[PDB]
Every structure is written in C-alpha cells, then in structure tokens.
Assembly symmetry: C3
C-alpha cells in the first residue's frame, strides 16, 4: 500500500556514476596515500574529481559501485578551481551522471552528497542548498560556491551533489573543519555549470 | 503578504506518533551514597521484551526503563550478544504496552528518510532526521544525528516502521577533525533474529 | 529524462521568510575612531514599523549595533530593551523604503517531526539556510535546559545563527534560535534550541510599550 518517503530514485539514477578514487604512491609495493571521490561525466570514460585528491600520484585507481576497478589516466588539472579530469578505458558501457544543463539550483533545494568518506564505502548524505554564491566579500574568498548542509567528510571530495531527481548540482570540495569552533553542516561544491566548462577545456587543451 | 493559513506544513509527525511511544529511556544504575550510563530501548512486543545496547547495560545493579507515557519499570536482563552489541530486557507487560510498528516485508533502501529516536545527553526523548546512507556495513549507516544517549534506540521510516537499532557513530579521525553524520544501526530483521535467540537461550 | 519533473525543494519557505532575517553586528572600540566587530548574530524583522528581535547575548556591551538586510540595506539599530529571562532583545530601525517582514501565523501549532529551516549568518559566511525537524516542543519534567518551553531542532545551528529564525516548510515563524549547544565531554551533533514564536511575540510587545 503506502510507501516510505525516500530519495532512492535519485540514488539509483546518480550513485552508479560516482566513484571511489584512490591515489597511490611509491611507499619505499605501492600504497594508498590520498583518498577521494569522482564523477563519471561521459560515456568515453571521463571522470571529474578534485585536483588535491590526485596530486603527485604514481597510480590513480577508480572503483565503480558495480565492482569494476580501472587504472585511470590524468588528462589534466586546474588549480584555480581545484578540478582535475581522469580517463578510464572500459569495454562494457559506463554509467554516467545525469546532467540537466538547463536546471538552475535554488536555495532550499533538497540535495544528496555522494562520496566515499573515510573509505567506508559509497555513502549518501542529505541536506539542502544553503546558498548559491555570494555577491560580497566573504570568508571563502569566492563568489560562485554552492554551500550545502549535507554532511561532507574527508573522502567526499570530487564526489557528486545531486538534487531529488538525480541531476548533478556540483562537485563537493574539501570540508570546512575548524573555526576554533567545530562547524556543523557547512559544505561547499563547485557549481556544475563551471565543472562542465573546465572539463571540456582540460579535455581538449589543458 | 500572503495567506498560508490553510496550507499544510511538511512533517514526519505521523512517524513520531506511531513509533516514539514505544521507545524508552534505559537507565543503568549503580551504588554510590545513581545513574552510571543511560540509553534507549525499543519495546518489541506485548510480552514486554525490549531491545537495547549491551554497552548501555553492562555491570548494572539495577536497570530502569522509562516510557514516554510516564510509567517506570525495573527491567531484568534476558541476554546480550557481544558480537552485535545487542541486549534484551524484560519488564512486566500487565496493563498493556505501546509496541514499535514492524513491517517484516519492508526492505530498507538507500535514500529512505529515517528518524532517530532516543534520549541524547538525557535531554528527554529526541527525534532527529536523516536518510539511510548505506546498508551492509551487517549494519545500516545513517546521517540522522546520533549522540551519547541514543544507543539502543530506534531508527524508523516515514511510516513509523522500524528500520533498525541505533548503536554508535563513527569516531575515527585522521587530521584531528570530527566525523559528521555517520551513524550505525543494526537492521531490524537481524535484531529480531538475535532477540529470538537470546530469549530462547534464556 | 527528468527535464520536466520538479526537484523537491523548500525554496518557497526561503523566499517567504529569508528576506526578513537580518545580520546583526555588535561593534565596539578597541585600541585607538576604531569601531570593530566584537560579536555577530542574526535577527528577525517582526513588524513593518522596524522592530527586530535578536538575542541579548549578541547586543550586550555594544557601542554600536548594525543591522544588514539581505537586500543590501544597512542601518544603525536602536536597543529597545532586553529580557534576560529568555536572552531576547528588541531592536528598532528607521527606514524610509518599506521593510520585509517574517510570516507569522498565530494559529499554527508546532508539531514534533515538522520540517524546519534555520536561517542565520554562521561564521559571517552570509545568510545560510539549514534543514532539520523539530525534535521536541518543550519538556514536562526537569531537564538540562532548566526550562520547559524550548523548541529543540536538529537543523544545524552555528555561532552566528543566534537571534535568527526557525520556520516551517510554509515559511511561517516557529521560533528564534538561541546560542548553539557547542560542548558537553563529547561534541553534540544536531541539537539546537529556539524560543517558541508565541512566547517571543509577547516578550517583544511588552518590551516595546514598557521596558
């Protein structure tokens, strides 16, 4: 009869495209040095993630929720936005993140943060968009960040922030951790319109 | 400006009215000349059997259970499982008891809205909201704010059906930060399973 | 293809209430003009005449109180009075243009489990909206808050939210957020408090006429 309130539809549509990203180094036989998340943006195997997640890695590994694991190639990065692009080569079709180029994020929109915090396995948290940028000078030093109260922890960087429909809203960045009060529910994401742009460029140029 | 007088507020009150009455305050009392630990428990059925956390009731001289309707009962320990950290309590069922809604056919799905029900910091029964963040961790992971005092309490969906028994939050911190919104619960099917064994073996 | 579906959202509540929640700054002197920010909080414009509700703690010991609206207007606020008993303060601003006001439905009764949005200015990041539910509406017995009429919510509250608003999905004022419950032992998660709106309206009116 009756069904529980749920955001499972958005999960089923978007989670398959969000991947766990492992940065591995020399060690001296390789080991995990940095951990993060990433989003499969296209059928060809292009994945977005944060630049600080893959910096100075000797081997980047990408693990999908279906169980596939691939070695990924660094296609290029951008420090100004801390975005990086990876490339993987799969035989079977790759799941992609739903993108509605014409959807406009609104303050108060329900959102789900998808990533791999503390390497516990893919995790989905829920919140809303708290702000869609600032006009004046603020402590973040930026003007186009999306702010959300969906729990973000280390390991979430490079992951997806989607809406109740499963559409990409942005890429989560590092979390706001200290002041030294302990901030609660204050996270940031690079707006998706800006992530697509930076990607197309990096793919063909950078 | 406008009139919202007849509009209806979004709410999970239906789940509260149906589930919260069966979630009790569990007090671990000791000798001093007193409360040692405190947690929550879920009344599982009319027989008076209650599920809670093993760590909440360890080494107790007297275990007290308090219902939201005002009644207080002394509970006897029926059994506990080191492996899952669950424990079963027993109070006198005469006079009828509120029980937690259970839909044995309901399967929890990642993304389902959940409410954590317990007594954090002994502030009084508290309801927090989140979603099922993951399953098979056999633990359910949730971002419903959980605090000391919530252990042994309930995790229910918007219909008020039990999804699991809350245990602890994630504490591992690397650079020195505090994990946010990462809590665990034992899936209701498994908890039911353990309870049956604990009761039977008792 | 979701192109035609509608994303779940509380944007309606934000558009109705947020414009009336202001940023409150407490400025004082320091070393050697030289008026700096000493404390920061939020406030809610309750009446078109310009009366604003905030927390006493934020405006205590202030040489100058500044109030900034989300539309860009900045004013110097006048301290009308305080109520130590609830940490509520009333401010007055004199504006020519017309002021946005918080939606108040006096017949609405807050229920445990209702969705709520906290609106304020945490860490001076600029107006922020967080989401949760009402965890409790008062307590019958003696409890750690020492009071019986506090609203409790798990909507993330941070330093800066104080004096700000808590509204429901309709944008109706549920209460005025208090200082954030920051430390036990452990560090609490999702536990905040607010003064119920009906109580805040009575306190305001009395302070206006009397003191």
């Amino acid at each position: 009869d009756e069904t529980p309130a749920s955001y499972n539809l958005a999960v089923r549509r978007a989670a398959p495209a969000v991947v766990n990203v492992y940065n591995r180094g020399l060690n001296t036989q390789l080991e995990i040095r940095t951990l993060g998340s990433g989003v499969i943006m296209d059928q060809r195997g292009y994945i977005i993630t944060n630049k600080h997640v893959i910096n100075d890695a000797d081997q980047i590994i990408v693990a999908l929720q279906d169980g596939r694991v691939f070695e990924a190639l660094l296609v290029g990065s951008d420090s100004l936005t801390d975005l990086a692009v990876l490339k993987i080569n799969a035989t079977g079709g790759l799941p992609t993140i739903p993108i509605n180029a014409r959807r406009v994020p609104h303050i108060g929109d329900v959102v789900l943060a998808i990533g791999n915090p503390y390497n516990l396995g893919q995790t989905i948290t829920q919140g809303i968009i708290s702000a869609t940028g600032r006009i004046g000078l603020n402590p973040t030093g930026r003007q186009n960040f999306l702010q959300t109260d969906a729990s973000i922890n280390h390991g979430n960087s490079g992951g997806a922030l989607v809406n109740s429909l499963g559409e990409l809203m942005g890429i989560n960045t590092l979390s706001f951790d200290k002041s030294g009060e302990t901030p609660e529910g204050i996270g940031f994401a690079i707006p998706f319109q800006l992530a697509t742009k930076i990607m197309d460029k990096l793919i063909r140029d950078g």
